[PDB]
Scaffold this active site. Structure first.
Site, PDB file in Angstrom:
ATOM      1  N   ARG A 187       0.823  -1.219   0.000  1.00 48.78           N
ATOM      2  CA  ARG A 187       0.000   0.000   0.000  1.00 48.78           C
ATOM      3  C   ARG A 187       0.853   1.264   0.000  1.00 48.78           C
ATOM      4  NH1 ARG A 187      -3.146   2.596   4.790  1.00 48.78           N
ATOM      5  NH2 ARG A 187      -4.432   4.100   3.643  1.00 48.78           N
ATOM      6  N   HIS A 201       0.676   3.821  -3.100  1.00 54.56           N
ATOM      7  CA  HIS A 201       0.193   5.190  -2.842  1.00 54.56           C
ATOM      8  C   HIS A 201       1.225   6.245  -3.215  1.00 54.56           C
ATOM      9  CE1 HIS A 201      -3.579   4.502  -0.308  1.00 54.56           C
ATOM     10  NE2 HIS A 201      -3.285   3.380  -0.945  1.00 54.56           N
ATOM     11  N   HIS A 210      -5.344  -6.325  -3.565  1.00 58.85           N
ATOM     12  CA  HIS A 210      -6.186  -6.540  -2.395  1.00 58.85           C
ATOM     13  C   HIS A 210      -6.243  -8.028  -2.016  1.00 58.85           C
ATOM     14  CE1 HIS A 210      -8.353  -2.517  -3.308  1.00 58.85           C
ATOM     15  NE2 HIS A 210      -7.525  -2.351  -2.291  1.00 58.85           N
ATOM     16  N   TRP A 222      -9.954  -8.927   2.254  1.00 64.59           N
ATOM     17  CA  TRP A 222     -10.615  -9.412   1.040  1.00 64.59           C
ATOM     18  C   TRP A 222     -10.557 -10.934   0.911  1.00 64.59           C
ATOM     19  CZ3 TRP A 222      -8.053  -4.899   1.477  1.00 64.59           C
ATOM     20  CH2 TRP A 222      -8.671  -3.741   0.978  1.00 64.59           C
ATOM     21  N   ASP A 250     -14.230  -2.555  -6.025  1.00 64.66           N
ATOM     22  CA  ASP A 250     -13.967  -3.944  -6.429  1.00 64.66           C
ATOM     23  C   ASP A 250     -15.133  -4.482  -7.258  1.00 64.66           C
ATOM     24  OD1 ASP A 250     -11.493  -4.206  -4.692  1.00 64.66           O
ATOM     25  OD2 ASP A 250     -12.882  -4.413  -3.064  1.00 64.66           O
TER      26      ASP A 250
END
Ligand code: HEM
Ligand SMILES: O=C(NO)c1ccccc1O
Ligand code: NA
EC number: 1.11.1.11
Length: 249
Positions: free
Chosen positions: A38, A42, A163, A179, A208
């Site tokens: 992440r 990002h 994810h 997830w 999603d």
């Protein structure tokens, strides 16, 4: 593709190789692979092709960028990496964070994403608001990944499979839970779970679910659910591209 990678010194290359190993052990032990993926994504995902601003140039460590709401919680990731970064003073933060993202994918059992060094740290964070909004749909995904980052529809679906590791937190985004049933294992289960519908204890964001109803995204979801090798190939391609946005062009 279209890339001309810079030359870095032998000592720089030596540091990359040593940092890769150190990052493996650290990320595996700390159980923070998803958070590091992440972090890297990002940092990279703010690239805007029209202006050539943002992208994977180390700015995510700046307090101003960590304060963006989509970056809630990434201050923890930056703190966790700082002692290790300090062992590799020769490396750019940009290279270090992107390497951490590549390692996060590897140590959880994902594909080996090619890595090339030489990103130079930029002085100024990009403006807030470029990262994707979990409550929106396919038009928004194409605005962010396509119109801004310059990635393809294939890359959108493959990268959404990031994810397949990790979870949301009600104190960070507000969404909550993993997830997949194995949030530290990188495999194609994100797509399997998306297709089987809602299961208790598992998370699906509106973003999603947008993949299921789109004419271009859905065949890709189906492909990846049926063929993990195909997912791994397209994921490695997309993550490499993401990690190199604005770099070595
Ligand atoms: C497709 C558009 C995307 C949306 C709307 C989105 C949204 C979100 C949200 C809301 C969270 C939860 C944050 C939290 O509460 O802790 C999250 C977590 C995460 N995202 Fe995404 N994301 C997207 C794409 C991506 C991409 C492209 C990647 C990387 C390839 C990625 C990797 C992750 C990971 C690994 C986590 C788990 C973090 C953890 O376990 O702490 N996401 N994402
Ligand atoms: O972590 C995220 N994406 O991976 C994310 C978190 C909060 C809001 C929007 C987002 O895209
Ligand atoms: Na998983």
């Amino acid at each position: 593709s279209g890339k001309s990678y810079p030359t870095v010194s032998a000592d720089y290359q030596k540091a990359v190789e040593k940092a890769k190993k150190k990052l493996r052990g650290f990320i595996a032990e700390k159980r923070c692979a998803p958070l590091m993926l992440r972090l890297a994504w990002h940092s990279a995902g703010t690239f805007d092709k029209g202006t050539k601003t943002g992208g994977p140039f180390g700015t995510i460590k700046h307090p101003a960028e960590l304060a963006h709401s989509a970056n809630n919680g990434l201050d923890i990731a930056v703190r966790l990496l700082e002692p290790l970064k300090a062992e590799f003073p020769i490396l750019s933060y940009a290279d270090f964070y992107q390497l951490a993202g590549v390692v996060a994918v590897e140590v959880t059992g994902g594909p080996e994403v090619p890595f090339h060094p030489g990103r130079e740290d930029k002085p100024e964070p990009p403006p807030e608001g470029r990262l994707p909004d979990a409550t929106k749909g396919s038009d928004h995904l194409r605005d962010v990944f396509g119109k801004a980052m310059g990635l393809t529809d294939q890359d959108i679906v493959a990268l959404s499979g990031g994810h397949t590791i990790g979870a949301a937190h009600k104190e960070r985004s507000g969404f909550e839970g993993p997830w997949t049933s194995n949030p530290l294992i990188f495999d194609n289960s994100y797509f399997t779970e998306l297709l089987s519908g809602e299961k208790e204890g598992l998370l699906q964001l509106p973003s999603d679910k947008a993949l299921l109803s789109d004419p271009v995204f859905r065949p890709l979801v189906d492909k990846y659910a049926a063929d993990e090798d195909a997912f791994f190939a397209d994921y490695a391609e997309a993550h490499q591209k993401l990690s190199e946005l604005g770099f070595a062009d």
